[PDB]
């Protein structure tokens, strides 16, 4: 009974990282979609500028949200688990596999931040790139 | 139990979110209105104007959407926490009413801040009116 609800709280962190992570790229598609239609009007310099700022401060603010939300879920898995060891008697297995898991999840978590960020830098050059054409 | 006190401190957290929420989304209008009195003076072509206006409002728009987003993200991943807490501990059935009725304050808070920001914009968007009438 212990373990499996050790497992099965690794099962659920792995299946929100998925999840971020199609939601974070989804994210940046469309706002590649949004980029290419400014270039193709161009109107007056005030116009470019105001809107392309807001379409890169609207894609961080929702990047930056899903991974606290990433951050928040395993910060309640982590101590959730020692609480599950602390009612179990004291077994120095599982008090030597918890950690194993715990870093595990902690790793894909910085994993998926540095796609998300590698993304976003990506975007950050191409609407500089349009930024620089007026 | 302890548990009731994680879960106290998750809604303050949640407390911490729309206050910054709050101050952020004021602090957006506020810079479009000077972007609107800076328009108003330079008195430039009427087709500079209305285009100029237009990538103004939709840029609050889309800023002020993209900070309610982050906040039901925000939302959703504490009341997640608060599940993993409650099965983790015992059980649920002890405090379903209490997290429910914690849940149904935090999204009620969370109904107010999304009217403040209503009201704003649509405040806004009478001073880009007038901007569009005086031109």
């Known amino acids: 009974e212990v373990r499996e609800k050790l497992k099965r709280m690794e099962k659920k962190f792995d299946d ?6 199609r939601k ?3 994210i940046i598609k469309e706002a590649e979609k949004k980029l290419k239609t400014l270039k193709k009007r161009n109107g007056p310099y005030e116009a470019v500028v105001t809107t392309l700022r807001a379409i890169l401060k609207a ?6 949200a899903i991974i606290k939300a990433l951050k928040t879920e395993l910060d309640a898995l982590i101590k959730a688990m020692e609480t599950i060891l602390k009612a179990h008697d004291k077994n120095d297995e599982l008090k030597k596999e918890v950690e194993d898991i715990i870093k595990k999840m902690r790793d894909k978590l910085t994993k998926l931040i540095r796609k998300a960020k590698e993304l976003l830098d990506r975007l950050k050059k191409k609407a500089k790139k349009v930024q620089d054409e007026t």
């Open 59 to 64: 894609v961080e603010t929702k990047i930056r």
């Open 16 to 21: 929100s990282l998925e999840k971020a992570e």
């Open 24 to 26: 974070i790229r989804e």
